[PDB]
Design a protein around this nucleic acid. Sequence first.
RNA 1: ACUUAAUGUCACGGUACCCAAUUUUCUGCCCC
RNA 2: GGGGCAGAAAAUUGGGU
Length: 1188
Amino acid sequence: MNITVELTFFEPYRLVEWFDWDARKKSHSAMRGQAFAQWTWKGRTAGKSFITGTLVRSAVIKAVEELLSLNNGKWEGVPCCNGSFQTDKKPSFLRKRHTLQWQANICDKEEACPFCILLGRFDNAGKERNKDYDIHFSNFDLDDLRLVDIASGRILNRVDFDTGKAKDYFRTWEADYETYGTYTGRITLRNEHAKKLLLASLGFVDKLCGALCRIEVIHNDELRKQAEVIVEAFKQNDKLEKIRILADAIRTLRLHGEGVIEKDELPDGKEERDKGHHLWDIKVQGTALRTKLKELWQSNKDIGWRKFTEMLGSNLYLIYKKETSDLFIPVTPPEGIETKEWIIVGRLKAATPFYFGVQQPSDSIPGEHASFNILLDKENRYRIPRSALRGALRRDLRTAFGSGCNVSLGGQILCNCKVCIEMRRITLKDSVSDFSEPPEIRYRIAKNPGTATVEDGSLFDIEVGPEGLTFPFVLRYRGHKFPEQLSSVIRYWEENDGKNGMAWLGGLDSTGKGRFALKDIKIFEWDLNQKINEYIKERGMRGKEKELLEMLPDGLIPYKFFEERECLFPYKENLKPQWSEVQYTIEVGSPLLTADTISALTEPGNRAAIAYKKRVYNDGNNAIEPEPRFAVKSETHRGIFRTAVGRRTGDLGKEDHEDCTCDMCIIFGNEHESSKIRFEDLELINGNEFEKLEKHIDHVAIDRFTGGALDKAKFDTYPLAGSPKKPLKLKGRFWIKKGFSGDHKLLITTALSDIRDGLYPLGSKGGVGYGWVAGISIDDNVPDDFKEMIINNDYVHPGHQSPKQDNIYYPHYFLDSGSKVYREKDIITHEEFTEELLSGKINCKLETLTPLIIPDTSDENGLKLQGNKPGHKNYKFFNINGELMIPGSELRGMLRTHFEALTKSCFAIFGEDSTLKTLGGKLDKALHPCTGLSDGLCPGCHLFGTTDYKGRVKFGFAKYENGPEWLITRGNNPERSLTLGVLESPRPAFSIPDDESEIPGRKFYLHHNGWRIIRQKQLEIRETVQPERNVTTEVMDKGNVFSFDVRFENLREWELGLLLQSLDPGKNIAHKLGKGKPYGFGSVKIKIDSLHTFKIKRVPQSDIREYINKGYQKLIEWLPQWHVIPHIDKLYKLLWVPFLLEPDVRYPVLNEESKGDYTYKKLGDKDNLPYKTRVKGLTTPWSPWNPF
RNA sequence: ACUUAAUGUCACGGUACCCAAUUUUCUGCCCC
RNA sequence: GGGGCAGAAAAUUGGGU
Ligand SMILES: [Zn+2]
Ligand SMILES: [Zn+2]
Ligand SMILES: [Zn+2]
Ligand SMILES: [Zn+2]
C-alpha cells in the first residue's frame, strides 16, 4: 500500500550538502545539519535538494510517541506497548533525548503493536537491501536548479547573556519556501495495522529542517561598464573624491521613484551659476550626468528601478574601491495530566527603527555597498527570522526566570535548567513584513576625543528598517501548563497603555534599533489531551496563522486565562525593572543641522547641507507617511552622552579601551561587553508650530586679505528653525538597566545636566551657534531616582588724523603686522576638562553704533521689490521665526578676524591660486592657513579651530532683547530700508600693483558715518545705477542692543583674557558686521554682561582683570596700554570710532564719474602718484587720501 | 537513479551580536 | 565700464567573538 506524502514548508527551511554518513564526520556543517534538508550536486552548481526518508521517519516516530503519550499509548482504541529504543550495530543517529513513555503481551514478529511496526522493530529489513521493510520512508525529492536559486547562505549567532557580545557563529543555508518549498516522497506500508497511526503522525508532525511544515497524503556587465565610464569621466574632471559620495546618492535614489531620473527632479544648480549642480551637472563622456543616468535608466528598464539603482551604486562603489554518553531517558508523564498547545498570534510593530544584521553580499553566496546590510528575503521585504526572535525570547525568559544557562553546543544531555526546558516546548515561526521598500541608510561617525572632530577611517552606513512596520508574530507552546515566566515575556513585549513595548529584537540595541512593540495579541489553545482529533485535521493551524490573527477553527477555543501585566511575579520582579526609561525633551533655541548631506544631493531644493529626517511607517494607513519626521539620530544622541561622561570622568582620551572596567566602559559598553544604557532617536515633536520648519541660512568664508568672499567658500545650510521665542522640542529617551549603582546614576544625571547647561550642542556648526540647547524638561514617568536628582573696559584709543580735521579717508586699510607667527604645537585637547584651564560662558551685549545690515538671504524678494524692478535682489534682515537675529557665524567671523589680527595669527581664509604669481605665492609662508596639527596652530587657529580640530570657542546666535528697531528713510519703498551702493568685488590689484609690492595685511574697514550719504542720496542711487547691480535691504537703527553668548571651553588663563579684549577692546573702539562696511554700515560695540565659569560660578570684575592683564602679558612675549604694541596700535586705530568728529570716508571714482580730485586713473596713476599707495593704504590706518 | 537507512536526529539546541556624535574649519561679503 | 563666488579640504570602515 504505497502512500504519496508531500512536504510543504511555510517558512525558510535549512539544507546542507548531503556528504555521506562516512563523509559527514569530516565537515562540521553536515553533522550540525543532520536534521536539515540535504543538497547533492548534479561542477559545484545546479544540484538537487531533498530531505532524507530517515529524517521524515524520525519526525514521524517522534509524533507517534507524542500522540501515544497523549492517549496513554493507545491510538484509536488499539493499545500499543512502550516500544524499544535500545541497541546492543548502533543506528546511524542516536536519540540522546528524553523519550516519552506510558504504562503499557510480549511483542514478536506475528502480532506486533502499531507502534512496533511503525518503528519497523520486527520487519524483514534492518540496518539496506530491497524493499523488505514493513514501513519504508523513501527520499523526499523537491518538486538545473542552481543552489543560489533555492537558498542563500546566512550566518547565525550565539549571543552571550552576561555580556551582550556574540561568543560564536555558524553558517546556514535557509532555503526559499515560497518557490522551492514542496517535497514529494513515497511511504510504503506493508502492514495495514498501523496505517491510521501513521497518518495521524504525518498530520501531527509540526516542523522539519528548521521550518514549520505540513504533511498531506497524495544585467551587470553593461551597468558596471557604464559606471566605469562615469568614474573615468570624473577622473577627467579630477573629481574622484565625490564618486564615493555619488555611489551613496545612487544608492539612496532607490528610495525615490523612477520620476527622479525620468522627469529630472535632481537639483538643477544655481540659476546664474552656469555650471549647474556640482555633482549632477558634470559632463560624463561629454554628456551631463543627469542625462547619462536617464540614458542608463532607459537602457536598463528591464531590471527595475530599485535593482538598477542598487547595482549602479554598488558598481560605482566597487570601481572607487578597486582604485582605493549513550543513555536512554524514559519520561512517563503522570497519569491523568492535561497537556495543551497555546498559540500566541499578534503583530510585532517596530516602535524604533529596527536592524537585523546580515553578512555582506558576495560573502553570503552559498557554495556590496553598505557597511551593514539589513536582512531581507528574496522579495526585498523586511524579515524577522525566528532564530533571532527565538534567541531574544531565550534571553528574556532567562531574565524572567532569573536563573538560566549559557546554552552549550554539542552536549549529549539535554539541559535541565528552567529556560531550556521551556524553549523545547516553545516553537515560533519566521515572519516577513509585507513591505517591499528599500531600507533607509543611517550613517555613523566616531569623534576623536582629543580634537572633537571625526576619526580617520571611522565612517560607516547601516541599513535600517522604517519605524512602525508590523511583523506577524506566532508562538506555539506545547506544555502541560502555560508558564507565568513566558506570560511575563509576552506582557513584557506587549505594548500596553504605558508599557509601549519592550521587545528588544535584533541588533544595534544600544542605539535603539529594534525595540518592537508586540501588539494585537490573541491567545488560542488546543485541548491536546482530549481534543486531538481535529488537530491533525487542521495541522495545528500551521502556515495559516494570519487567518487566526484576522479571526473559527474547531477545538481552538481562545485561552481566556492569560494573566494581565501587573499579575505575574517574574514580570514585576525581574522583567519590569530590567530596563528603566528616561524620557525627556531637549529644548533647542537655535537652528538645528544634523547634516544629512547625502540626501541633500538627491532631494529637490539644491541645499548644500540639509537636516536629517526619518522615514516612519504607518500601520493604520499603510505605506510610509508622506511627511518625514526630523530627528537627531539616536547614535548622535548616544555619542553625546558617551562624550559627556568621558570628559567628566576622564575615561575619554585613554590610550585604548581594552577589556576595561572604567565608568564609561561600564555604562556604555566596550569591545567585551554591552552598553547598559541604550538611546532612542530625538524626534522633533515641535514640528507643526513652525510656519517654515526649516530655514535657509547662507554662509561664506571671507578672505582675510581682500575682506571679500573667497574663490570657493560660499555654502548654504538648511537647518531646522528655532529661536529663544520659538524653540524646537526634541522628545528623546534612553533606557537604563538595573545595574547602575548610585555613583553611575549620578554620573549620567550629570551628563544630562551638562546637556541642559548647553556644553554639548546638537548637530553640526556648534561653534557657529547651531543646536545650542536652551534647557531640558524631564518627563513625569521618569523614576524619582533620576528626576529628583536633576564688566566695562576702560581702555581709550587716542586717534591721530581725524581729531585735527575740524580730509577724505579710504574706506578700508590693511593691517601689516608682519609674518611673525607663533604656533602652539602642544594642542589643547577637547578631552576631559583640565583643572588649570578655564571654561564657561560669556554673556555679551551688542550695541550698533551705525546702521546694521544682516540680510536674510533665504529670499531674494524679502521686501517684495522684484516686481517693480526685475533683478533687484531686495533683502530682509536676518530673522528666524520672525524675530531679528544675528547668526553666530557673523559674530564668530569678525571676532576671529579681530583675534587673528590682535594675536598675529595666519590668514586662515586666503584666496590662494588667484592671479594678481598667485596671491598665495606672496603671503610669505607663516601667514598661510594651517594644515594638520603636525606643524602647530595659530592662537586664532588654536582657539576658533581649523580643519580636523574643533574650535574651543562657540559663538551663539545673537537675540535682540529690545531697542530702536528700524531706520526710517522716509522715501524708500518699504520706508524701513536703504538701497545700498554698487558693492563690487574687492580688487587686490590696487593693493598689489607690482611684483615689488609683496602683500598687504588684513583688510579692516573704518568706522565712519558714511551711511548718511547713502541715506541722503537715495533718490540719486535708485536711478543712476541699474537695479540688478544695486541691493536694497532693511537696516537696523543706531544704538540697537543685541545679546549673544560665547560658550568657551578649555581656554588658557590668557586665552580667555585675549578673547575678552577681542570682544571689548575698550572705549572708542568697536567692530564691524554685515554689508556696508565700506559705506560705514554695521559698527557694533560688544560689552560683556557677565562671565561664568564652571570647574556655574560667575567671576567678578576683580577676576575679569588678571585674565585680560595676563592676556596682555602673553601679547608682550610674542591697566594695560594696548597701543604700546605696534600692531595693536594700528589694529585699534582701524577699529577706533571717531564719534563716541565726523570724518569723510569714500572710495575714489573712475575719472570724472558721478562724483560728490580723488579719482581713479589719477590717484591710481604711477606718474601722478608713486607706488607708495600700499604705504598709505596699508600700515597707516587713517591716512588722508583726497589731499593725501 | 541522482540522494535516506530503519528498534534511537533536544539543531526551534545557538539573536550575526558588541564598540563609534555626518562631524571639523568658514562674517552673504564687497570698488577699480 | 564690470557681478564674483554659490561649496572647498577631510574621514567614507576599523576592530572584536
Ligand atoms: Zn509492542
Ligand atoms: Zn539551559
Ligand atoms: Zn574604559
Ligand atoms: Zn593658523
